[PDB]
Write a protein that binds this ligand. Structure first.
Ligand SMILES: Nc1ncnc2c1ncn2[C@@H]1O[C@H](COP(=O)(O)OP(=O)(O)NP(=O)(O)O)[C@@H](O)[C@H]1O
Ligand SMILES: [Ca+2]
Ligand SMILES: [Ca+2]
Ligand SMILES: [Ca+2]
Ligand SMILES: [Mg+2]
Ligand code: NA
Length: 311
């Protein structure tokens, strides 16, 4: 931190105590939030922000540099060949991927499978030239369980069939049971603390994204209140994905009129990739990608078995 203009040993202390230990967090901060820190004046705040941006080289980029930025995105395999294909390789870091669908479609299964897959080095696809082995080493997951359906048994079973050690997945997966939207949002905001404590959080799961909000703000005469809170939550998730180069996955429920993911416009805008998971015959499932910034809408057929997600 003292590498930053105006920042001395004392100011560096104030910053770390305030939660600002990374150059990127400072470069992307507002004069206000920094001035909210005791002895940090407006000029000092503005000076260190500009300095952090410079050190992080956050200016105009063009040509090959645009490809290099895109190469810092790594992807997590879903264990499904067709789904990985529709995803353009796998679940993308630096983005929010939403899986919506009717009950029993497999949303929670995909979340569990992702926590397991994170522990298989060969399931993280990346360009070694842009992403070092160290950046994805000792990856850990955060599972914000809003519906109380996290199941250690399922983790162990999926791990076993993948040839991975179940206990290792549990040891490297943080689960936070949220009973309402306030806890849900706070847990998400506190993931930064886990990072600061030395945990390489590379996967963040929110299951479910909207169930709490939908139950707390029912009156359609309070919908604005809900969309605002939902918007702040989504903003935290997106920034989280970018600053810590991790994949963020969220599940969403559906309502009639055929079906549409709930959460309104804000969720639609904030989500990067949007899927509708449908049920086929027996254990067959169809993941339909209907929105993304660079991939064509497409369908991926897969199955949910005792082994987890397969095909
Ligand atoms: N141990 C298992 N072995 C085989 N199939 C399983 C196992 N556990 C769950 N399933 C399948 O997973 C389906 C449920 O997946 P799940 O991801 O929980 O649905 P969901 O979309 O999240 N539904 P909901 O929480 O109501 O929105 C079941 O109905 C089972 O067919
Ligand atoms: Ca992003
Ligand atoms: Ca259910
Ligand atoms: Ca079933
Ligand atoms: Mg579920
Ligand atoms: Na096994």
């Amino acid at each position: 931190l003292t590498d930053l203009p105006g920042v001395g040993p004392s100011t560096a202390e104030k910053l770390v105590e305030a939660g600002y230990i990374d150059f990127m967090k400072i470069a992307t901060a507002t004069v206000g939030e920094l001035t909210d820190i005791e002895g940090i004046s407006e000029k000092a705040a503005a000076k260190m922000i500009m300095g952090a941006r410079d050190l992080c080289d956050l200016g105009f980029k063009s040509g090959i540099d645009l490809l290099k930025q895109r190469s810092t995105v790594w992807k997590l395999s879903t264990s499904s060949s067709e789904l990985d294909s529709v995803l353009g390789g796998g679940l993308e870091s630096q983005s929010v991927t939403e899986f919506a669908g009717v009950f029993g479609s497999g949303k929670t299964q995909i979340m569990h499978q992702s926590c397991v897959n994170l522990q298989n080095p060969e399931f993280l696809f990346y360009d070694e030239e842009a992403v070092s082995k160290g950046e994805v080493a000792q990856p850990k997951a955060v599972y914000i369980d809003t519906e109380g359906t996290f199941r250690p048994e399922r983790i162990m079973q999926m791990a076993e069939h993948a040839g991975i050690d179940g206990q290792t997945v549990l040891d490297n997966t943080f689960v936070a049971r949220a009973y309402n939207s306030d806890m849900q949002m706070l847990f998400a905001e506190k993931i930064e603390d886990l990072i600061q404590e030395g945990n390489n959080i590379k996967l963040v799961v929110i299951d479910s994204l909207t169930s709490t909000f939908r139950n707390e703000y029912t009156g359609r005469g309070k919908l604005a209140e809900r969309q605002q809170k939902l918007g702040r939550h989504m903003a935290t998730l997106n920034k989280l994905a970018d600053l810590f180069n991790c994949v963020v996955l969220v599940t969403n429920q559906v309502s009639a009129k055929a079906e549409q993911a709930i959460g309104g416009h804000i969720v639609g805008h904030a989500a990067t990739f949007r899927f509708f998971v449908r049920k086929g015959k027996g254990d067959k499932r169809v993941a339909k990608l209907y929105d993304s910034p660079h991939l064509p809408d497409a369908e991926a057929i897969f199955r949910i078995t005792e082994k987890g997600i397969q095909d």
